[PDB]
């Protein structure tokens, strides 16, 4: 009966839409930061998170969202999701300052799974960052 979830995350996203409370990122973070979570809500949840805080941002959010990216093992099953992870983690930034540069460095700090595909996508498109 996997479907009621979509109805939940949906409502919430519209619930604290315009409020920026504390219970939001309070439970949302873990859902996609705790330690390895079903890509069912993990991705979705994350999306909503950025959806609201799409404007402003913070480090805690990133440092966390990152912790998950690592706890994301293809142990679950085969499915396309790089579309979401990229999107969020993407819009998540917009400023300037070798910011995204450091991020990519992390993805490399660890192993080197299929994520490599992303290393190119982002690594390619980005502001000037030569010498």
């Amino acid at each position: 009966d996997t479907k009621i979830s979509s109805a939940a995350i949906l409502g919430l996203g519209i619930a604290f839409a315009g409020s920026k409370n504390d219970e939001v990122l309070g439970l949302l973070l873990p859902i996609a930061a705790s330690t390895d979570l079903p890509i069912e809500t993990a991705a979705m949840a994350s999306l909503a998170l950025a959806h609201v805080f799409v404007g402003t941002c913070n480090g805690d959010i990133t440092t966390s969202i990152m912790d998950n990216f690592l706890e994301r093992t293809a142990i679950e099953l085969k499915t396309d999701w790089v579309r979401f992870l990229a999107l969020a983690l993407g819009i998540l930034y917009m400023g300037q300052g070798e910011q995204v540069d450091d991020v990519l460095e992390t993805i490399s700090a660890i192993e080197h799974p299929m994520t490599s595909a992303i290393e190119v996508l982002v690594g390619s498109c980005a502001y000037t960052g030569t010498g």
């Binding site: 873990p30 705790s34 330690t35 390895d36 979570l37 093992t73």
Partner: protein, 76 residues
């Protein structure tokens, strides 16, 4: 001491413990309530994992405290 334990979803649990109670003990009360085994638990508070052996007094965990229950998992 009446403490609350919020699950990584919504459902909450009210455990009647004390300040001299050990985390491990709490996890036990949770296993008897729900059915999840200790080895498969992880209490988090203020964004920090609560090591076992310690007591609810070390973390100053007072009453009506909402402990963030989670399920730890290995990695690589």
């Amino acid at each position: 001491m009446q403490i609350f334990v919020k699950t990584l979803t919504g459902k909450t649990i009210t455990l009647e413990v004390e300040p001299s109670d050990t985390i491990e003990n709490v996890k036990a009360k949770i296993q008897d309530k729900e059915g999840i085994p200790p080895d498969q638990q992880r209490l988090i508070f203020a964004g920090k994992q609560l090591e076992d052996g310690r007591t609810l007094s070390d973390y100053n965990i007072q009453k009506e405290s909402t402990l963030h229950l989670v399920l730890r998992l290995r990695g690589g």
